[PDB]
Design a protein that fits this description.
This is part of a larger assembly, with 2 copies of chain A. By secondary structure, chain A is mainly beta. The first copy, chain A, is 0% helix and 33% strand. At the A-B interface, strand 11, strand 12, strand 13, strand 14 and strand 15 of A face strand 1, strand 3, strand 8, strand 10 and strand 13 of B. Chains A, B: Belongs to the P22likevirus tail fiber protein family.
Chain lengths: 331, 331
Amino acid sequence: FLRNNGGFERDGGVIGFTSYRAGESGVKTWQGTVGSTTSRNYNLQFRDSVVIYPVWDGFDLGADTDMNPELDRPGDYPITQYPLHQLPLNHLIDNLLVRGALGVGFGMDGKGMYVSNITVEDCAGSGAYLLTHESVFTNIAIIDTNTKDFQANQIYISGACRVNGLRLIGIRSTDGQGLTIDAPNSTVSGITGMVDPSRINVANLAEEGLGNIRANSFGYDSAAIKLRIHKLSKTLDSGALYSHINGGAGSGSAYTQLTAISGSTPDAVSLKVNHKDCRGAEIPFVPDIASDDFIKDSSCFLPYWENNSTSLKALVKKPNGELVRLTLATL
Amino acid sequence: FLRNNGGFERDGGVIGFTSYRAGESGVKTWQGTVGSTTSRNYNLQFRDSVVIYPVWDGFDLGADTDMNPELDRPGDYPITQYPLHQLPLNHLIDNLLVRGALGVGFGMDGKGMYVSNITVEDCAGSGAYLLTHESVFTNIAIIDTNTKDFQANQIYISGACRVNGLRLIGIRSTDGQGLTIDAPNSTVSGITGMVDPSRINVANLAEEGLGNIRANSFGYDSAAIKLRIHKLSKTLDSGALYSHINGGAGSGSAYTQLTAISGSTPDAVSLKVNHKDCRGAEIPFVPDIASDDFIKDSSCFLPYWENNSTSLKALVKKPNGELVRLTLATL
């Protein structure tokens, strides 16, 4: 479509399509200002369209090129009103499919756009790239893409875009690993799959709506709900609840660890209960004399070891907030 | 559809359709008995249908709404046989898209209904008001609905329904009561989005399908997994597991603390592990003399403070089940 406005109705579009081996794109709404007039499209309905094996983009639902158009866009909202790669088109997008693409499978720009049910798979190059800023998306699936490893993304967002539901990873993807998702400025939720936390780079990731947590071990002999901060490192946990079986499996006895990472070695400091079926608490202590900056908690005591006296002592921070050293254990 | 029964064949329906500005509902099965004879519809197939900008619902798939609250319902089963908002309509419901609704975008009633793949986005009013009872709603995306706050929530369920998967939180979210989902009689599992627990009012919220999982934090200097009971208080935790970085980020050492609520003030009493790189556990104690109702666990000991002695003393409940007060540490 070249310079089509479906107006109020949203009349015009394509429902049902297949394209094989386009030299450009199978389904396109053209971008930039062509000549002194606009080629940009508005208000079109796109459902059940398919473009397989494109040389470049499979789908282009954009309206703005990488280079800026002439100022105060003709026939459209100005460049001042909406910066580059922002301008509402109000296209409706559902049920797209791409297989095998040398180029990208999917790409668009705009602001105020609403997108659902995008599927791209199998791809030699990228599954997805976006130019979008401040757009909404749902239910994106990028599987297997970059088989022959020709870009290092599989999905990219440049925006502040808010997205829910992302499922990833074929048999073998990413580039040899180098971010499935690079979108450091976008808030994305619903990221799940066999994707690694070192394949994820986003601005914020959380999913706090989930109920009571239950973890099931399959392919593992340990059960954990790990906590990881990615400013700490994306390969180092910041804490975890570990449960490891004492003795062989089926014993019915296991120890639960409340752990904190130290020195970049996980389970360096562990508070264990029922450790090797003791039925007691194995509590760590400082291997050297306790410092005054190792305790900040009123009405708590930090046990420490004194090698010199061969006795376990406690640095007690009272509810008075003052420090006093007591002898905790001596034979 | 006025008085259409597709029978066991499931004939009739709407497939491959786009509707714009209906003064009632774009695709509508008429509610209850209208006219001398029934207008209620059974066994119709709705797939790949789009309703853009309906005044009310885009898909009104009910048939038992506001008509005949009395003992007999004409051309239909009595209200004694099936309560109001319950009928075995058995419509085939998959792949439906609603956008632009001024009011509620989706509504239906019935029992034994199985609903899948419903995406309602960019609506001025609510995404769904579900008058269904004993119906299953699978793969539901309610994103950026109730953005003018006519209603009080993005999605409402009056009855008890089973919702497997949900996606909440768009680029804007509700503030008409600030409840993202108010559906206090429905049991919802798998809520996706960064929606706060206090903004979720549901009958039962639990997960039992998740495996061994890792929590990922981005844009946060802490990873928090919080344990919250909303009978206790909606906005206050009953316990939480925090992991905060020791010193600056990238250290590779982070202290994990286990917190509990006391006095209605969260993180009042905590047990810290690896507190400021000490590799020892902080053991809290009672700021006053321990009570004999505080500890009731055989083979456990509760430390307590006595100010005049300036010495730790621990009330020990022996494995004999008898209490003895021994001095834990001496000055």
